[PDB]
Design a protein around this nucleic acid. Structure first.
Ligand code: K
Ligand code: K
Ligand code: K
Ligand code: K
Ligand code: K
Ligand code: K
Ligand code: K
Ligand code: K
Ligand code: K
Ligand code: K
Ligand code: K
Ligand code: K
Ligand code: K
Ligand code: K
Ligand code: K
Ligand code: K
Ligand code: K
Ligand code: K
Ligand code: K
Ligand code: K
Ligand code: K
Ligand code: K
Ligand code: K
Ligand code: K
Ligand code: K
Ligand code: K
Ligand code: MG
Ligand code: MG
Ligand code: MG
Ligand code: MG
Ligand code: MG
Ligand code: MG
Ligand code: MG
Ligand code: MG
Ligand code: MG
Ligand code: MG
Ligand code: MG
Ligand code: MG
Ligand code: MG
Lengths: 378, 51, 65, 92, 139
RNA sequence: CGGCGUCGGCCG
RNA sequence: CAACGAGGAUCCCACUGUCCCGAGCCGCGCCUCCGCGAGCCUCCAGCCUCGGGAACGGGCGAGGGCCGGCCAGCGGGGCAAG
RNA sequence: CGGCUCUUCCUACCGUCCGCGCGCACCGGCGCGGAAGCGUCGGAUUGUUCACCCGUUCAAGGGAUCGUGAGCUGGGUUUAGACCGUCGUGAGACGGUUAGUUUUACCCUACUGGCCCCGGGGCCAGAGCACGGCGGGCCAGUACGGAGGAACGCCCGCCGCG
RNA sequence: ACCCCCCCCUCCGGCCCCGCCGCCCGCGCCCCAGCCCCGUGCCCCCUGCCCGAGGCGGCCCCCGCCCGGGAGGACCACCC
């Protein structure tokens, strides 16, 4: 018989299977589309999730009920030390998709990159790029090998790695990622730009800008094995059910005589690969600047690290970026950031009047250590 | 106000045609069968109260 | 920045913290945290709670202008 | 009661239409290549399409007629639009 | 002409503290003592979900046995002006009241009383101009 | 029960 | 018909996780390991769709899938067992 | 038996989408073709399916062993106690009424996750799939026609879902 | 055209490029029209039956754990 009252299904079938992610980190699967003629620019960066705070900003909208008023917004903080570009890869568009031409590495490779090639570093015998460094010593080989990417490739990407000795993390090996070069006048102009970045650092202020939108890619918090009420959000059965009320009662009709893939079942919850889109950039600064988080509205000097320190992260030493809202993962997961594929259209500008630097360990009420000391001055 | 000659010009697009009693398809004047269903049962389009 | 003073204790409240309560004699009260709000609702006397502004004023430890 | 406005653009390769029945949407119709469109310089409220290809000239005039549609009304009473009046050759 | 529905402008979403079955206090001087809330306007529901309202919403009520005899046995429109469930505004302020209250007011926006006792919220004063003019306090 | 789909007939 | 009832009913006050709509926590089982160590049941086997057929097939005709070996769970089917 | 829970399917389409017709001025109704994506709800009395009223964003009809009890519940019906009315010489019979134990998975398949050690970065065959609906401002008390009373477009919110 | 298909998005056998560093196998390229069909209505027809370079296309092979922490977790696995 027909189900008597109308009600939708529970949960989204386009995020199946609910298995643990097997990719290692967030992997950028698409890049923004290249526009022939546009100025050259980079499209991606890799950071680590540091914390959350909230800000006061002056809203300049039109037709909105907050048109000339003040709003308090939640912002997330991402730690972004400079990345080092170590290799150039090219690909060709073929009747079988993207196929690569060759990958040209740099002459000299750093310790953080070399450690990613080994399981244990102290014990291993070190024979990565042993022949390559000898041949590539004279720079002529690179020029010849770049003489192919200019002649056969349609898409150019750079290989770049992070420097984990400038963070509070525990790992010592880098995270390696391809970054696509968009824009330019022809292919041959994008290889002169990639060569001029070889073995050099890249700052996040030279990819993203303030007020633009980005996409954040990461792996979500894990909860392990979990039943249907929490994993899927189905209704809890009444109190006098004999064997427990945290279940789906009927898991299929008699025919077909199988269990369907559309029925809610228990299993792994969390630790999934996800993409949250259209995040607006609030501020790009550095933690060495002691005036990075000071508006006029306060007169003291305030910087990014809070009183007490970033709970469960550590101390931020260099560059960071600030996005509105929230992003997947716990503190310290690596987050990939790209330009927005289909950005939201009617977003107002960014005009910050105040940022919270009070302690997040507990309920802190002092912006700075100096004025807590003045408060308890004996 | 629309001058009478523009009315006649517009009336050969909004009026002056045949409807098919079975499927309500527009058909040309002096047409025997319906263009869509192929039946022979066709009336005129009714006149407006200002026509 | 613009700030408020807790009505139960004397502390300052920063933008985006605590909660307000509208009493029925048309008087507003601004609370720093939930602890301060529970003390007020139970009718615990501010002068007997030793960390408040009111207590330290009554104990000579706080200078009254 | 609502005068239609019409500006030839793109050096007679497109036309814009404004203010059809007092509406905010504007209309842009490009000519199929080889066709030119001029405002009448003789008798007011009248457009002129010219070209060598008869399919191309008629396909452009029909694409203009199809761009000015009155929605959800008795069309026997609301009769605004752009209508083909003369289908002939040129006269030099 | 003369249409003029009820509720001036747009409203942001806030926490709804009162579901169907709640009994709230009467804040004007019509004669009613308590109002029993039986429905919410503009409510599209979902299976098993109770309808619910916040301050500023128009609700349907019945006047209870402690109220005046003439007002009883009828489905009357009203507006909630105070609630106990705490809610967050856009500027980051969290605020709540001591009790739950409403006034009797028709969808054209004209009140059935001459006064309102105690403070009212800004949510109800912005949507309903008549409430903003006879209120003695707005928080 | 309808068919200016196509090919073939009969009666004027 | 006063009094009385682990008797059958309707309503109100008070009370509440019965419910809107669920969330967090404690102990013990489960789970992994050392020692010990059974019952029930079993034509043969164990992936589907249609047809025909003792008129609802795992096997028969035709099509679509599929290394092999295991665990924690689960109740659609085995017209499951008793 | 129903209900609760949960999933999938049909179109003989009720609202929303696109076209035509009217005894279509506007508004609002009505008739037809294509269309199964989303929506079709909260309560009072009844075991009820059904029905009947109140309310709301105003509320189509069906299938899957009359889908679904080793998923539940056990109100109904449906053993053994007991009462009433009619019937029977009688033991007893039949319209109402009250009290009445809901057993077992560790096997096989299906399904949900997990495993059988093998560098770094990528590409893509196959399979999965997700943005609908309701308002407000301007247009405008304007087109239309006295009373009344629209629309394309842009912008701002809400509800349901994720 | 709320429909249908693709993108975005989730999984992903296999494969490719790059690091450390050998084997084998095959021998054959005009294009475009059919109511111009441009002079056609053929060739091949011996993969051993006596065939066995270079270039041009293929094929194979090539990479540890235990141990302890964790943002991960039934056991395993995963990230360090
Ligand atoms: K059913
Ligand atoms: K059902
Ligand atoms: K359930
Ligand atoms: K089933
Ligand atoms: K399933
Ligand atoms: K389910
Ligand atoms: K389950
Ligand atoms: K995603
Ligand atoms: K409340
Ligand atoms: K025939
Ligand atoms: K007595
Ligand atoms: K008794
Ligand atoms: K007794
Ligand atoms: K008794
Ligand atoms: K729980
Ligand atoms: K049969
Ligand atoms: K059969
Ligand atoms: K059988
Ligand atoms: K069966
Ligand atoms: K429909
Ligand atoms: K009993
Ligand atoms: K929403
Ligand atoms: K919702
Ligand atoms: K939601
Ligand atoms: K589909
Ligand atoms: K999409
Ligand atoms: Mg039980
Ligand atoms: Mg039991
Ligand atoms: Mg904290
Ligand atoms: Mg229900
Ligand atoms: Mg809750
Ligand atoms: Mg069998
Ligand atoms: Mg067979
Ligand atoms: Mg079973
Ligand atoms: Mg049944
Ligand atoms: Mg069963
Ligand atoms: Mg049972
Ligand atoms: Mg009995
Ligand atoms: Mg696909």
């Amino acid at each position: 018989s027909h189900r008597k009252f109308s009600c939708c299904r529970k949960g989204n079938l386009g995020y199946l299977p609910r298995k643990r992610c097997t990719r290692g980190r967030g992997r950028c699967k698409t890049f923004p589309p290249d526009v022939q003629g546009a100025p050259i620019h980079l499209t991606a960066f890799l950071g680590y999730k540091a914390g959350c705070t909230h800000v006061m900003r002056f809203i300049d909208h039109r037709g909105s009920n907050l048109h000339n008023r003040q709003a308090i917004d939640q912002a997330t903080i991402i730690d972004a030390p400079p990345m080092i570009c170590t290799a150039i890869i090219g690909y060709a568009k073929t009747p079988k998709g993207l196929r690569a031409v060759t990958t040209v590495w740099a002459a000299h490779i750093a310790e953080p990159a070399m450690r990613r090639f080994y399981r244990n570093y102290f014990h291993a015998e070190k024979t990565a790029f042993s022949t390559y460094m000898k041949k590539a010593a004279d720079g002529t080989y690179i020029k010849e090998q770049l003489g192919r990417l200019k002649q056969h490739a349609d898409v150019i990407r750079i290989v770049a790695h992070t420097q984990p000795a400038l963070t509070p993390l525990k790992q010592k090996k880098a995270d390696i990622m391809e970054i696509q070069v968009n824009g330019g006048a022809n292919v041959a102009e994008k290889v002169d730009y990639a060569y001029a970045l070889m073995e050099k650092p890249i700052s996040i202020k030279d990819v993203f800008s303030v007020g633009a939108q980005i996409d954040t890619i990461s792996i979500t918090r894990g909860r392990g094995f979990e039943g249907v009420v929490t994993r899927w959000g189905v209704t809890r059965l009444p109190r006098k059910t004999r064997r427990g009320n945290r279940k789906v009662a009927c898991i299929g009709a008699w025919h077909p005589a199988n269990v369907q893939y559309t029925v809610a079942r228990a299993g792994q919850m969390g630790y999934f690969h996800r993409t949250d889109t259209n995040k607006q950039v609030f501020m790009i600064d550095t933690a060495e600047n002691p005036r990075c988080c000071t508006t006029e509205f306060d007169l003291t000097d305030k910087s990014i690290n809070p009183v007490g320190g970033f709970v469960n992260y550590g101390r931020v030493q260099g560059d960071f970026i600030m996005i509105k809202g929230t992003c997947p993962g716990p503190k310290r997961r690596p987050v990939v950031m790209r330009n927005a594929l289909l950005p939201h259209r009617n977003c107002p500008p960014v005009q910050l009047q105040w940022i919270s630097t009070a302690s997040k360990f507990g309920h802190g009420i002092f912006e700075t250590v100096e004025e807590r000391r003045q408060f308890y001055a004996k | 106000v629309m001058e009478p000659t523009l009315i006649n010009l517009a009336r050969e697009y909004n009026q002056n045609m045949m409807i098919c009693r079975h499927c309500y398809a527009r058909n040309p004047l002096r047409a025997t069968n319906c263009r869509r269903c192929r039946g022979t049962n066709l009336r005129k389009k009714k006149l407006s109260k200002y026509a | 920045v613009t700030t408020n003073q807790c009505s139960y204790s004397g502390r300052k409240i920063l933008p985006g913290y605590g909660k307000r309560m509208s009493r029925h004699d048309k008087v507003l009260l601004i609370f720093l945290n939930r602890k301060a709000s529970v003390h007020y609702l139970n009718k615990w006397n501010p002068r007997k709670i030793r960390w408040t502004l009111a207590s330290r004023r009554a104990r000579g430890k706080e200078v009254i202008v | 009661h609502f005068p239609i406005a019409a500006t030839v653009v793109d050096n007679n390769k497109a036309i814009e239409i404004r203010n059809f029945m007092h509406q905010i949407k504007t209309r842009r119709i490009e000519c199929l290549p080889g066709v030119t469109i001029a405002m009448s310089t003789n008798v007011k409220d009248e457009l002129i399409l010219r070209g060598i290809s008869i399919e191309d000239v008629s396909h452009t005039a029909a694409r203009i007629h199809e761009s000015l549609k009155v929605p959800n009304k008795d069309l026997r009473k609301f009769l605004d639009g752009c209508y083909v009046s003369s289908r002939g050759l040129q006269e030099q | 002409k003369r249409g003029r529905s009820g509720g001036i402008g747009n409203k942001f979403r806030i926490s709804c503290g009162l579901p169907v079955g709640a009994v709230i206090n009467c804040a004007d001087n019509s004669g009613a003592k308590s109002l029993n809330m039986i429905a919410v306007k503009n409510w599209k529901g979902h299976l098993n979900r109770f309808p619910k309202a916040s301050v500023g919403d128009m609700v349907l009520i019945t006047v209870g046995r402690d109220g005046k005899p003439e007002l009883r046995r009828k489905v009357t429109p009203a507006v909630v002006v105070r609630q106990r469930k705490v809610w967050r505004r856009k500027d980051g302020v969290w605020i709540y009241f001591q009790d739950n209250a409403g006034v009797i007011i028709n969808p054209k926006g004209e009140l059935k009383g001459s006064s309102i006792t105690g403070p009212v919220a800004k949510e109800a004063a912005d949507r309903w101009p008549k409430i903003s003019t006879t209120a003695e306090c707005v928080h």
